[PDB]
């Protein structure tokens, strides 16, 4: 669920999920169409794609638990929907962490019309 994810994001990047990530590029937060504008945008894209493989789960409201083994994010045994979700968020977390150095503000609050193009997961 978002609470977990957001907290995971803050620990990892030091930036707050909302609003640093709720309206970035074409895929962070609003999902939908387009060509990811950048690495972070791709992270979000691969992430939306991750929730896409769990049709009958509820990434948003289902809560899972995770811990840190020295800085490592470690998803704890829960329902199977819970485990698979958590893996999906961990990746996004890492991913964001891996491209902080190219996180660009001109993609904050990006207008929808500039998000057209095709991309299959």
Ligand X SMILES: COc1ccc2c(c1)c(CC(=O)O)c(C)n2C(=O)c1ccc(Cl)cc1
Return the active site residues: 47, 89
Helix axes 39-52, 80-98, angle to 10 degrees: 170
| 6 known ligand binder | no
| 27 known ligand binder | yes
Rounded to the nearest whole angstrom, what is the least distance from the CB of residue 116 to ligand NIM in the complex?
A: 20
Rounded Cα gap, residues 76 and 15, in angstroms: 24
Site for ligand NIM in 18-37 (CB under 6 A): 18, 21-22, 29
User: For residues 16 and 29, is the Cβ–Cβ distance under 8 A?
Assistant: no
Pick one of 7, 31, 94, 103: the residue that binds ligand X (CB under 6 A): 31
| 38 known ligand binder | no
Q: To 5 degrees, how large is the angle CA 88–CA 90–CA 93?
A: 115
Pick one of 33, 60, 63, 65: the residue that binds ligand NIM (CB under 6 A): 60
Interface mask (CB under 6 A) for ligand X, residues 55-74, using x and -?
A: x---xx--------------
- Other CB atoms within 10 Å distance of the CB of residue 53: 10
Options 15-23, 42-50, 77-85, 97-105: segment touching ligand NIM (CB under 6 A): 15-23
Q: Which helix (H) or strand (E) holds 66?
A: strand 66-69
Start-to-end Cα distance in the chain: 22
Residues interacting with ligand X, by CB under 6 A?
A: 31, 48-49, 51-52, 55, 59-60
């Amino acid at each position: 669920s978002l609470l977990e994810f957001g907290k995971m994001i803050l620990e990892e990047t030091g930036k707050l999920a909302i609003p640093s990530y709720s309206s970035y590029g074409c895929y962070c937060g609003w999902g939908g169409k387009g060509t990811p504008k950048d690495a972070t945008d791709r992270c979000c894209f691969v992430h939306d794609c991750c929730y896409g493989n769990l049709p009958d789960c509820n990434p948003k409201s289902d809560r899972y638990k995770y811990k840190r083994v020295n800085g490592a994010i470690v998803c704890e045994k829960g329902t199977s929907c819970e485990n698979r979700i958590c893996e999906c968020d961990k990746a996004a977390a890492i991913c964001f962490r891996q491209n902080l150095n190219t996180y660009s503000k001109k993609y904050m609050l990006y207008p929808d019309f500039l998000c057209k193009g095709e991309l299959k997961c």
